[PDB]
Design an enzyme around this catalytic site. Sequence first.
Site, PDB file in Angstrom:
ATOM      1  N   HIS B  39       0.806  -1.215   0.000  1.00 39.52           N
ATOM      2  CA  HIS B  39       0.000   0.000   0.000  1.00 39.52           C
ATOM      3  C   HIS B  39       0.844   1.273   0.000  1.00 39.52           C
ATOM      4  O   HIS B  39       0.272   2.371  -0.047  1.00 39.52           O
ATOM      5  CB  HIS B  39      -1.026  -0.023   1.152  1.00 39.52           C
ATOM      6  CG  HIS B  39      -0.466   0.124   2.536  1.00 39.52           C
ATOM      7  ND1 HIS B  39      -0.696  -0.811   3.525  1.00 39.52           N
ATOM      8  CD2 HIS B  39       0.223   1.130   3.128  1.00 39.52           C
ATOM      9  CE1 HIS B  39      -0.143  -0.405   4.654  1.00 39.52           C
ATOM     10  NE2 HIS B  39       0.431   0.765   4.439  1.00 39.52           N
ATOM     11  N   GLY B 141       2.828   5.754  10.445  1.00 40.36           N
ATOM     12  CA  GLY B 141       4.197   5.676   9.987  1.00 40.36           C
ATOM     13  C   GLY B 141       4.936   4.432  10.424  1.00 40.36           C
ATOM     14  O   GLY B 141       6.097   4.248  10.030  1.00 40.36           O
ATOM     15  N   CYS B 143       3.817   1.356   9.641  1.00 35.59           N
ATOM     16  CA  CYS B 143       3.612   0.311   8.644  1.00 35.59           C
ATOM     17  C   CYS B 143       4.948  -0.182   8.105  1.00 35.59           C
ATOM     18  O   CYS B 143       5.867   0.605   7.855  1.00 35.59           O
ATOM     19  CB  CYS B 143       2.744   0.831   7.493  1.00 35.59           C
ATOM     20  SG  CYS B 143       1.061   1.166   8.030  1.00 35.59           S
TER      21      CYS B 143
HETATM   22  O1  LIG Z   1      -4.402   1.671   9.602  1.00 35.76           O
HETATM   23  C1  LIG Z   1      -3.791   2.189   8.725  1.00 35.76           C
HETATM   24  C2  LIG Z   1      -2.268   2.357   8.851  1.00 35.76           C
HETATM   25  N1  LIG Z   1      -1.862   2.194  10.241  1.00 35.76           N
HETATM   26  N2  LIG Z   1      -1.346   1.097  10.760  1.00 35.76           N
HETATM   27  N3  LIG Z   1      -1.097   1.254  12.045  1.00 35.76           N
HETATM   28  C3  LIG Z   1      -1.452   2.529  12.411  1.00 35.76           C
HETATM   29  C4  LIG Z   1      -1.405   3.237  13.631  1.00 35.76           C
HETATM   30  C5  LIG Z   1      -1.865   4.564  13.672  1.00 35.76           C
HETATM   31  C6  LIG Z   1      -2.366   5.183  12.497  1.00 35.76           C
HETATM   32  C7  LIG Z   1      -2.414   4.478  11.287  1.00 35.76           C
HETATM   33  C8  LIG Z   1      -1.956   3.145  11.239  1.00 35.76           C
HETATM   34  N4  LIG Z   1      -4.512   2.651   7.548  1.00 35.76           N
HETATM   35  C9  LIG Z   1      -5.965   2.502   7.451  1.00 35.76           C
HETATM   36  C10 LIG Z   1      -6.334   1.112   6.939  1.00 35.76           C
HETATM   37  C11 LIG Z   1      -7.610   0.590   7.116  1.00 35.76           C
HETATM   38  C12 LIG Z   1      -7.897  -0.687   6.638  1.00 35.76           C
HETATM   39  C13 LIG Z   1      -6.909  -1.427   5.995  1.00 35.76           C
HETATM   40  C14 LIG Z   1      -5.633  -0.901   5.831  1.00 35.76           C
HETATM   41 CL1  LIG Z   1      -4.308  -1.810   5.036  1.00 35.76          CL
HETATM   42  C15 LIG Z   1      -5.356   0.367   6.309  1.00 35.76           C
HETATM   43  C16 LIG Z   1      -3.834   3.290   6.438  1.00 35.76           C
HETATM   44  C17 LIG Z   1      -2.966   2.563   5.633  1.00 35.76           C
HETATM   45  C18 LIG Z   1      -2.334   3.187   4.570  1.00 35.76           C
HETATM   46  C19 LIG Z   1      -2.601   4.525   4.324  1.00 35.76           C
HETATM   47  C20 LIG Z   1      -1.910   5.211   3.159  1.00 35.76           C
HETATM   48  C21 LIG Z   1      -1.408   4.570   2.038  1.00 35.76           C
HETATM   49  N5  LIG Z   1      -0.887   5.533   1.298  1.00 35.76           N
HETATM   50  C22 LIG Z   1      -1.042   6.693   1.914  1.00 35.76           C
HETATM   51  N6  LIG Z   1      -1.671   6.508   3.057  1.00 35.76           N
HETATM   52  C23 LIG Z   1      -3.476   5.249   5.121  1.00 35.76           C
HETATM   53  C24 LIG Z   1      -4.103   4.627   6.182  1.00 35.76           C
END
Ligand SMILES: O=C(Cn1nnc2ccccc21)N(Cc1cccc(Cl)c1)c1ccc(-c2cnc[nH]2)cc1
Lengths: 299, 303
Positions: B39, B141, B143
């Site tokens: 992603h 951040g 991920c």
């Molecule tokens: O939750 C996360 C990421 N994340 N992880 N731990 C976390 C702890 C605190 C905050 C966020 C966190 N999400 C939402 C999501 C919802 C369902 C499925 C998926 Cl895969 C992601 C996400 C993932 C990628 C992006 C993105 C990709 N390009 C630009 N922005 C934006 C949001």
Amino acid sequence: FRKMAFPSGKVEGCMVQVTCGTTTLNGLWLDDVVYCPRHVICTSEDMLNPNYEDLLIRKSNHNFLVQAGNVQLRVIGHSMQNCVLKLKVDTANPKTPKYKFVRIQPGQTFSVLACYNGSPSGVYQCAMRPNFTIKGSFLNGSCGSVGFNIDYDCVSFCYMHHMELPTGVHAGTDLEGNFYGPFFDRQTAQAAGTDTTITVNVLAWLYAAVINGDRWFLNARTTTLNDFNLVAMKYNYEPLTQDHVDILGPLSAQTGIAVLDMCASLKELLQNGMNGRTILGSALLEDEFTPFDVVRQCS
Amino acid sequence: FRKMAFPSGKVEGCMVQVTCGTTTLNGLWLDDVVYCPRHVICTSEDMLNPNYEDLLIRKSNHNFLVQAGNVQLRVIGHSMQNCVLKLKVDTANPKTPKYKFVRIQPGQTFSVLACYNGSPSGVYQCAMRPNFTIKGSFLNGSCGSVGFNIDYDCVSFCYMHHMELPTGVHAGTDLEGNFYGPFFDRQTAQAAGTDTTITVNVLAWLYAAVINGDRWFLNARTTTLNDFNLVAMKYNYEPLTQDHVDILGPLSAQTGIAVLDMCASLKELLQNGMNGRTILGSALLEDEFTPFDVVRQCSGVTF
Ligand SMILES: O=C(Cn1nnc2ccccc21)N(Cc1cccc(Cl)c1)c1ccc(-c2cnc[nH]2)cc1
Ligand SMILES: O=C(Cn1nnc2ccccc21)N(Cc1cccc(Cl)c1)c1ccc(-c2cnc[nH]2)cc1
């Protein structure tokens, strides 16, 4: 919200094995000096009642065997600073990080890299108790393992492990060899002073519980700082200072819960108990997170 | 009895940052390949409904910024494997440890090296819940941070972080890009199924209690595994597998307490409670120490 230790890599590169006769433990290799507990020079009989200056003068450089991985380091000099032995070696550690030696205050936290025979076993977070003991996870062979904090690539070493007390808690020194607490390096039974709970840390953890969506312990009551400190001392909690109140400020601002309102929650928690409930997964009030530890993990 | 992470140095030397467009996350650099969540190629609006195959076709090697600290590693190849992106880089990582990719079972634990912008921030121990979520500690951040175990200086990578769920738990994949659990990398409302207690770990913890002399809960009965499994499910506990019985083998031999005798003692604790007593100072039964965690901490296993 988890207990989180600093990554251990920069300290791992410094761990070595120090051997004197049949005694072996861990040492910390920084530049061309290896630091370790001075009781490595004791036989098991010596440990029962050692005179360290007398024992050290009778040792030669060749009595000390330092091993880094599979390399032998040659000791070219030795001195003693309080309870710490300092071995000069003929090789500088190429993995020495930027570092400092600091003495930490009761209630502050640090990471421990538990080591055996100079090799790393595990890393975990600890607090310096108000009685100057630590609730560690150390087995025989762990002496010389160190505690540390890391800030912007600099490792601040604060703890070197020396012993386990009969109650199972642990005691040690700073990197200048001075024990934390009223302990001494003689193998004889030693009791610690009565421990107390780190109040500012409990309040920080309660704030962590609110940031993570758990508010069941909150209430409407208020309290003054002095009145809270009266109850705190009654329950063997450390006093809360105005600087503690200020340190909790950022956590108070983030949650919209005044410090003294959280104190009223803690006071109700102490006087009524937890009624079988849990906070952040724990059935006891956790006091080994500082306000900084909470802020770093929650922001 | 406290949680203990593996020393993290071998993994720290493999963490990098990967940026595509304005999106930055963490990557894992082993030999000449960098692994990261696919992603990274999405915009925040793409996440709502992505077509990863279409988004990747419009990317070229020169669209990916891989940095070790601030030092760029030139990308010379790219491909997608399930939910992970593999970026071939022009430099083999000299810090690459001996390693393996493994897929773990619910209940198994691992250390997580939480990272931000490719920079390690902290290390902690995590369990994979039976609902295939983890109760980790991740901010935005993080991920691409990985979970791992160590065995005699071979690092077994088992988890890569991808997402946070509304309940605040976390979901991710193995190093081959296959999600743990029924989750997907799309920002659509998803929810963790109902969780259960990890029975094999509770039993490991009761064995740790016996090792340390805390054994008031050993009762006088036994049970069969089938009978125990049917009862335990009524208390929202996981059933035991044959592998579970076997991994309790060393603790059973060390204490002389048969696995099925310990199952009978746990069953009694479930049916009658603790009566205000504690085990290892805890009024609650702990379920995030595996049998291996108990032995690793009770022995001086080094790496
Ligand atoms: O939750 C996360 C990421 N994340 N992880 N731990 C976390 C702890 C605190 C905050 C966020 C966190 N999400 C939402 C999501 C919802 C369902 C499925 C998926 Cl895969 C992601 C996400 C993932 C990628 C992006 C993105 C990709 N390009 C630009 N922005 C934006 C949001
Ligand atoms: O506790 C420890 C060492 N230790 N540390 N963590 C531990 C965890 C589990 C078990 C032991 C542990 N002690 C007892 C001690 C009692 C009061 C003061 C001090 Cl200083 C030590 C010790 C230290 C040196 C030697 C020694 C040196 N040469 C020969 N024998 C022998 C025993």
